[PDB]
Ligand binder design. Structure first.
Ligand SMILES: CN1CCN(c2ccc(OC(F)(F)F)c(Nc3nccc(-c4cc(C(N)=O)cn4C)n3)c2)CC1
Ligand SMILES: CN1CCN(c2ccc(OC(F)(F)F)c(Nc3nccc(-c4cc(C(N)=O)cn4C)n3)c2)CC1
Ligand SMILES: [Zn+2]
Ligand SMILES: [Zn+2]
Lengths: 290, 290
C-alpha cells in the first residue's frame, strides 16, 4: 500500500518508486529516483504498522542512527531518511549487482583469488566499522552488496550495535543471525570478535561452496557451533585453511582482530586481483597473464 | 486457496469448511462439519507449500503421530487426518469456548478457586501425557482450550516430543516457546520437567494477571529466566506463592513431578469448584454458599 511517489518535506526532494528488490526483515526495498536530478537510489521502506511497539521503533531508529554516521567505500552509502506515517523511508546508495548471495547461488565455490579479492574489501569495511566502534553482528552473503564495479558494500545495519564504553560486553542480540558466534549463544556476552567469526564462515563458504555448520535444523547447527563441530575439505589449501581455523575458534580472544587480518599470509603471500571481470558473475576467471 | 469442501478418500467422510478460528504456526484452522452426520469439528489445515523441506514434514508428521496416539478428557480429541496435495487436514474435537488466553485477555487475574479449578485439569492432562511418555514443551494459555462446559483441553502438539528410552535427555527444541524452561536455554538437555516449569508460569499468570518474566524484549526475558529473576506480588497467598516457587526453580530435579503436584497443599487444602458459571468468562465468580 506504498506511495508511488515519495516526498521528503525537509529537503523537498521527491522520488519515484521503481522495481522491487527484496527484504529487510520488516522492510521491502525498491529502486527509486530523485525525479528532479533523476539520480537513482535504493529505498528501504518500512510500514509503521510493524513499528507499533516501542522496542521495534528503537531498533528501527538505532539502525538509522548507526548507519547515517557511516561513510566509506565498502559500506552502503546512507543518503537519508524521512517518514509520512504509515511508512519510514530510507534512501541508500544503489548496489547495481545485487549481493554476494546471488553470486554464490550462481557460482558456488569461488577461485582463491576471487575470495581474496572479496575478503579484503569485506575486511576493510569491517575495519572502518570497528574504528568507529560499531559491531555489525550479521555479516553474511546477502548483506554483502556489489556495485557495478563489483566492489563490496556492507549493508543492513539492522542488528548492529555501538560499543559505548571500553570493555563493554553486549549481553543480548535481538534477532537470529546466519553465521552466529559461539559466545552469543553461550550467552556470556560478546563484542567485536563476533564479526571476525562471521568473516571466518564467509571465507569458508566462499572457498568451500557451502557454509561450515549446515544441517537440516537450525537448532542442530547451533549445537554444532557450540562444539566447534565442522571440518575443512582436504582440497582447500593450507594457508587458507589455517586462516579459517584462526577465525573459527570458540574463544573470541584467540581469533585475530580485524586490523590484524590483512596481515595474514593468506593475503600477503597470494595473488589479489585489482578488479574482476564482469564475466565472473557466472564464469570462473582464469587470471591469465596475457 | 483452500477447498470449500474436504473429502477423506480413506473414510469417504466429507466436510464443509466453516468459520476461521486462528493459527497454528503454519496452520490456519476453521470449524468444519461432517456434512452427512453434520457433526462439527475443528480443522487444522496446513499448506503443503510450507512443507517442502523434509525437516518441516517430519515435524508435521511427528505431531500427528503423537497426537493421534492420545485419548483423554483433558486433551484435544484427535479424530483423524488426510491430505490432497496442497494441504494436510487434521480433524480435531471442537472446543467451543476458545482458550484460556482469551479468558485471560478479558478477566486478567483470576480468583484463587478459578485457578485451582483450571490448574487441576491442566495437571491431570499433563499426567496423562507423561504416563504416555510425551513432553508437550509449549504449555501456555493459548494452547489450553475450553469446551462448552469450560473444561480444559490441551492441544497443539506442534512442539511435543516422545521420550524413547528411560533417562533420555532431549538436546534441541525446534521452535520458540512462550513459557520456556531454563535448561532448554542453557542447552544442557531437558526432559519432563520443562512442562512442570510451564505450569508454574501459567499458575503465576492466572493468579497475578501477567506472566513472571515479561519484558519489552524476548532476549531480555530469556536472560531473566536464566537468572531466575522474577518476583511474586505480596497480595498473593503464601500457599499459592510457595507452589509457584517450587515449580519456578532453575534446577529441574528440584521441581515437583507432575503426579506429585495435585498433592500440594494448594489443592488439598483449598476450595476447588466442581464446575464454573459461564458468567465467569467475563465476571469474577463470588462462590456464594446459597
Ligand atoms: C538476499 N539478496 C540480497 C541482495 N538483493 C538485491 C537485489 C537487487 C538490488 O538492486 C539492483 F537491482 F540494482 F541490483 C539490490 N541492491 C541494493 N542496493 C542497496 C541496498 C540494498 C538492500 C539493503 C537491504 C537491507 N536489508 O537493508 C536490503 N536490500 C535489498 N539493495 C540488492 C536481493 C536479495
Ligand atoms: C490464541 N487463541 C487460541 C484459541 N482460539 C480459538 C478460537 C475459536 C475456537 O473455536 C470456537 F469458535 F468454536 F470456539 C477455537 N477452538 C478450537 N478447537 C479445537 C482446536 C483448536 C485449535 C488448535 C490449534 C493448534 N495450534 O493446533 C489452533 N486452534 C485454533 N481450536 C480456538 C483462537 C486463538
Ligand atoms: Zn529445526
Ligand atoms: Zn528484542
Amino acid at each position: 500500500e506504498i506511495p508511488e511517489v515519495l516526498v521528503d518535506p525537509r529537503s523537498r526532494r521527491r522520488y519515484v518508486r521503481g522495481r522491487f528488490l527484496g527484504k529487510g526483515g520488516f522492510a521491502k526495498c525498491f529502486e527509486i529516483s530523485d525525479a528532479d536530478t533523476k539520480e537513482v537510489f535504493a529505498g528501504k521502506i518500512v510500514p509503521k504498522s510493524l513499528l507499533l511497539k516501542p522496542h521495534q521503533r528503537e531498533k528501527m531508529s538505532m539502525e538509522i542512527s548507526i548507519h547515517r554516521s557511516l561513510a566509506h567505500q565498502h559500506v552502503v552509502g546512507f543518503h537519508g531518511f524521512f517518514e509520512d506515517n504509515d511508512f519510514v523511508f530510507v534512501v541508500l546508495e544503489l548496489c547495481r549487482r545485487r549481493s554476494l548471495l546471488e553470486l554464490h547461488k550462481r557460482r558456488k565455490a569461488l577461485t582463491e583469488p576471487e575470495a581474496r579479492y572479496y575478503l579484503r574489501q569485506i575486511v576493510l569495511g569491517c575495519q572502518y566499522l570497528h574504528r568507529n566502534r560499531v559491531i555489525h553482528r550479521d555479516l553474511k552473503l546477502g548483506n554483502l552488496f556489489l556495485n557495478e564495479d563489483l566492489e563490496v558494500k556492507i549493508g543492513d545495519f539492522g542488528l548492529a550495535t555501538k560499543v559505548e564504553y571500553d570493555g563493554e560486553r553486549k549481553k543480548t542480540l535481538c534477532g537470529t543471525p546466519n553465521y552466529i558466534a559461539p559466545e552469543v549463544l553461550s550467552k556470556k556476552g560478546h563484542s567485536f570478535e563476533v564479526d571476525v567469526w562471521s568473516i571466518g564462515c564467509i571465507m569458508y563458504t566462499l572457498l568451500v561452496g557451502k557454509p561450515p555448520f549446515e544441517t537440516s535444523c537450525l537448532k542442530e547447527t547451533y549445537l554444532r557451533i557450540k562444539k566447534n563441530e565442522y571440518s575443512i575439505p582436504k582440497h582447500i589449501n593450507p594457508v587458507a585453511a589455517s586462516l579459517i581455523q584462526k577465525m573459527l575458534q570458540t574463544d573470541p580472544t584467540a581469533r585475530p582482530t580485524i586490523n590484524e587480518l590483512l596481515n595474514d599470509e593468506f593475503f600477503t603471500s597470494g595473488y589479489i586481483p585489482a578488479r574482476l571481470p564482469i564475466t565472473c558473475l557466472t564464469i570462473p576467471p582464469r587470471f591469465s597473464i596475457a
